[PDB]
Amino acid sequence: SVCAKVDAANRLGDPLEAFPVFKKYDRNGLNVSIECKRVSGLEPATVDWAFDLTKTNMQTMYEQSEWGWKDREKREEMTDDRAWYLIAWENSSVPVAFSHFRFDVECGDEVLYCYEVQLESKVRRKGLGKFLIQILQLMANSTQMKKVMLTVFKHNHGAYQFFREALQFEIDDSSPSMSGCCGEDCSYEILSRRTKF
Ligand SMILES: CC(=O)SCCNC(=O)CCNC(=O)[C@H](O)C(C)(C)COP(=O)(O)OP(=O)(O)OC[C@H]1O[C@@H](n2cnc3c(N)ncnc32)[C@H](O)[C@@H]1OP(=O)(O)O
């Protein structure tokens, strides 16, 4: 059942274990190791770093959206027991990028939902962001999720092109239609990529 696959994925110790060669990224002057852990397996400073980076990167965009920036609410989302983190480490010490994701039931399907993918400014445009989303798609396959899903702000033109063009995400059926937010277009789109099987 749908329940069963989601529960099984959340019982994994290390979902990235099935793809050992993807635990390193050494391209374009980057040399990082990549780990996948429950939020419970991170040091508090790492969780704080991830939140701080998201706020630095996203606060202004949230403020111009229908949601606003909810400081406490974002911290609680990112520290939830069900959260998984993909973290890229430089020099065995310094976190420089992460994705926070969950295995969940979304519009009735077993899906890997990506809440955040965030990179430090200094490591952007070197393929690492694409690599992290690739890894999410690998994990979706090995756990037999039906899609990887996420939400993007349309005003975030870079991230929008990143997902729609570079990664060929499509607009999900759950994305609110035109005139869908209080009689007007929503500032965001829900995007997805189906797993192939
Ligand atoms: C669910 C989410 O979190 S939605 C919000 C996404 N996160 C943010 O906006 C936070 C700040 N930005 C980032 O963290 C990163 O820049 C990301 C995640 C958006 C993209 O990761 P990056 O590593 O920088 O991109 P990456 O190097 O992998 O780009 C691959 C391709 O995506 C496209 N792309 C990436 N960034 C851009 C951009 N700013 N403008 C246009 N196209 C882009 C390009 O086609 C690029 O290929 P190219 O360099 O050969 O032209």
Side-chain angles (χ1 to χ4, degrees), residues 1-25 27-69 71-90 93-154 156-160 162-177 179-181 183-197:
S1 71
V2 179
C3 122
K5 288 175 185 172
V6 169
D7 290 348
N10 284 317
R11 283 191 263 103
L12 292 172
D14 183 6
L16 188 50
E17 193 184 315
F19 309 96
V21 89
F22 291 89
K23 290 187 155 162
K24 285 185 65 82
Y25 186 83
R27 303 186 201 158
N28 301 309
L30 283 190
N31 193 9
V32 301
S33 56
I34 297 169
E35 66 166 10
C36 179
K37 287 191 168 194
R38 311 225 70 152
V39 76
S40 62
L42 304 182
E43 304 190 54
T46 306
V47 180
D48 291 349
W49 159 84
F51 174 79
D52 287 345
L53 178 59
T54 303
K55 172 166 183 170
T56 296
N57 290 352
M58 307 300 298
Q59 178 175 18
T60 303
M61 305 215 58
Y62 271 100
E63 292 171 336
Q64 333 309 324
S65 74
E66 303 91 337
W67 298 100
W69 172 260
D71 203 80
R72 177 183 43 84
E73 316 228 358
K74 261 287 159 177
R75 193 186 300 276
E76 289 167 358
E77 174 227 278
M78 293 183 74
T79 59
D80 192 277
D81 294 351
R82 297 160 290 183
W84 287 95
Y85 279 82
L86 204 48
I87 298 179
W89 296 88
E90 213 178 39
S93 36
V94 176
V96 295
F98 82 90
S99 179
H100 158 212
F101 69 94
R102 296 185 204 179
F103 301 101
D104 206 352
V105 172
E106 300 297 324
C107 201
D109 293 326
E110 56 269 66
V111 320
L112 189 163
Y113 188 89
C114 172
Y115 286 82
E116 284 101 26
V117 50
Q118 305 285 333
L119 273 60
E120 296 274 15
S121 160
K122 74 177 187 190
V123 301
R124 297 181 194 165
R125 217 61 188 263
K126 289 165 192 293
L128 178 55
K130 176 162 93 164
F131 198 73
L132 294 182
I133 301 307
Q134 295 171 218
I135 288 174
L136 299 186
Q137 291 192 81
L138 295 181
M139 293 188 304
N141 175 277
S142 61
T143 57
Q144 292 80 50
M145 299 300 102
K146 304 219 277 205
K147 321 168 175 166
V148 172
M149 187 181 314
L150 53 92
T151 301
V152 59
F153 288 129
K154 292 188 290 220
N156 197 355
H157 291 88
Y160 192 81
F162 173 70
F163 290 113
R164 290 294 317 276
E165 275 296 343
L167 288 160
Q168 297 281 298
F169 274 67
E170 57 183 345
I171 301 169
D172 195 78
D173 288 330
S174 63
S175 193
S177 80
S179 307
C181 275
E184 78 180 65
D185 305 335
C186 301
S187 68
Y188 59 91
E189 287 187 340
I190 301 177
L191 308 188
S192 61
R193 269 188 67 88
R194 300 179 112 83
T195 59
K196 299 165 161 67
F197 64 92

